[PDB]
Amino acid sequence: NLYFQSNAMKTVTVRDLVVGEGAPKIIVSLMGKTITDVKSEALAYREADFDILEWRVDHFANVTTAESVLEAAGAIREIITDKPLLFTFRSAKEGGEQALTTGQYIDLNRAAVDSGLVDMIDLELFTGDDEVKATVGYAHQHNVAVIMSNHDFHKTPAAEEIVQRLRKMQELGADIPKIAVMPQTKADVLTLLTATVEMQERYADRPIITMSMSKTGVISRLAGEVFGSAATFGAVKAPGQISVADLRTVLTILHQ
Amino acid sequence: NLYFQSNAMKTVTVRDLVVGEGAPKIIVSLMGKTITDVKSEALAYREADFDILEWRVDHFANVTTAESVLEAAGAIREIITDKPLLFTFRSAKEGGEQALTTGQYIDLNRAAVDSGLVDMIDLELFTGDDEVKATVGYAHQHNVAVIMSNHDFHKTPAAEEIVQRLRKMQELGADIPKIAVMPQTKADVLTLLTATVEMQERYADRPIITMSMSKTGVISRLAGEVFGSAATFGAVGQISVADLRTVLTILHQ
Ligand SMILES: [Mg+2]
């Protein structure tokens, strides 16, 4: 556990991966219900050309048993030994598969920070300012980086509001602010790109991750190098996801 | 000559190619100075995967000699027998390599129409309203389609102005309005895409082609299926024709 960050090139370096420099990094997510399912996925992903491995812990059936989470994290880390591992429990409020109280959610993340098996944790911006601040501090004290997140699965907020949220994430100490929004029109995709550009230009001093969801928003997953998003999600493995192989092809074609 | 057009799906069909439907089409350009150069380019492009061949006539040294231009169109057509051929003299004012009087430019396009060898001509929006109306009429009377164009190589107009130009092209009878603008900032690229969406959804009853130039605007060359541009330019920072098709296919699903 040790990561670096620079406000000159606006980068975060974890496990030798420099987020915020060069081409957008590909994040793939593990969604298994059991420990063996998580291993099957990790084995299947090991060959794929991705950069960061995200474990969606809300899909894990035994998330309330500390020993089981630790065992599954340990199993992933022994299959994917050199790529950064991001621990993500998506809350029910923001589309996650299970529900946990605020207290449990914070304890889960603190336990993931303690394990030494994860390089990063995902904390939701709207969890509560006191709780967010406390958990960011704890993660940082253990050399664990924080991706702070916010999702709107049904609409796209005004560009100014998207910018405001990303700024608040920086205010709260996020190492990498992250926002995903849902377009209802084609203009909404451009609104998300506008917000990304404005944030990068006016306020960002670290990498940021942004996305417009659905088939309509797929260009937001491809044009990060120009518009300013530092990472993008792909499936190894709906009609609005793009395969990791195809994402890598496009990113390479667009790389400058 | 023969082409079709439909305001239902907003398409123009020329030599079996349906512009405005499915994935955006790829236009490649011939830039040769001599008929021999033009022939070599066309031969080299013949086995590339592109949809429309554009002849950039302003690059042609013998443009003022009517028989030379006709012989060169004939030579291209012998090599590229199945793809639509777009005849384009880019004027000096809009970045073209040579200068012609308005009259000479109109005579050149009329001669192209008369040849029967070209499927489409490019006419510049700002050529002059009387001349544009007369030449669109002439092309149409001979079943030649018109791509009406406008370029700004140094800046991006306001979104409303981009839309206004595209609407004016429609009003003047363009089969396919086309605009290419240069971004000075990242936001300018988004302004071009915004204008594209606005035009296509609110006013267009036919295909439109839009582009934000430079490496910064590459996304405008890839995302036409969603935002509304019907075609994009490639060559056989710039993305190649092979790579362009790869990405367009990926986005088409
Ligand atoms: Mg169309």
CATH assignment of the domain containing B101: 3.20.20.70
In angstroms, the separation between the Cα of residue A115 and the nearest Cα of chain B is: 40
Annotated active-site residue A151? The verdict is: yes
How far apart CA B250 and CA B253 sit, in angstroms, is 5
How far apart CA B86 and CA B52 sit, in angstroms, is 7
From its phi and psi, is residue B214 left (phi > 0), alpha (psi between -120 and 50) or beta?
Answer: left
Annotated active-site residue A215? The verdict is: no
- A182: three-class secondary structure by DSSP: coil
Distances in Å between the alpha carbon of B179 and those of A219, B109, B165?
A: 21, 19, 8
DSSP annotation of B116: S
Tokens of A29: 């997510």
Residue type for A190, please?
L
Q: Are B162 and B195 in contact (CB under 8 A)?
A: yes
Tokens of A15: 């496990």
On whether B221 is known to bind a ligand per the annotation, the reply is yes
| A-B contacts (CB, under 8 Å) | 58
How far apart CA B88 and CA B167 sit, in angstroms, is 21
Active-site residue, selected from the candidate residues A93, A168, A178, A237: A178
Q: Is the dihedral of CA B62, B44, B209, B95 positive or negative?
A: negative
Please count the structural domains in chain B: 1
From the list A121, A30, A139, A105, the residue with the least C-alpha distance to A75 is: A30
User: What residues of A are designated binding site?
Assistant: 29, 54-56, 90, 221, 241
Cα B165-B166-B170 angle, rounded to 5 deg: 115
DSSP annotation of A235: B
Header resolution in angstroms: 1.9
Experimental method: X-ray
Which residues make Cβ contacts (< 8 Å) with residue B57, sequence separation at least 6? Answer: B63, B69, B87, B88, B89, B108
Q: At which residue do the structure tokens 């030579």 appear?
A: B75
Q: Which domain holds residue A143?
A: 1-256
Q: Are A245 and A39 in contact (CB under 8 A)?
A: no
Q: At which residue do the structure tokens 């496009």 appear?
A: A250
- Chain A residues closer than 8 Å to B223 by CB: 219
**Beta-carbon separation of A226 and B193 below 8 A:** no
Question: How close is the Cα of A213 to the center of ligand 1, in Å?
Answer: 22
In angstroms, the separation between the Cα of residue B8 and the nearest Cα of chain A is: 20
Question: How close is the Cα of B183 to the center of ligand 1, in Å?
Answer: 24
Question: How close is the Cα of B17 to the center of ligand 1, in Å?
Answer: 13
Which residues make Cβ contacts (< 8 Å) with residue B252, sequence separation at least 6? Answer: B22, B23, B225
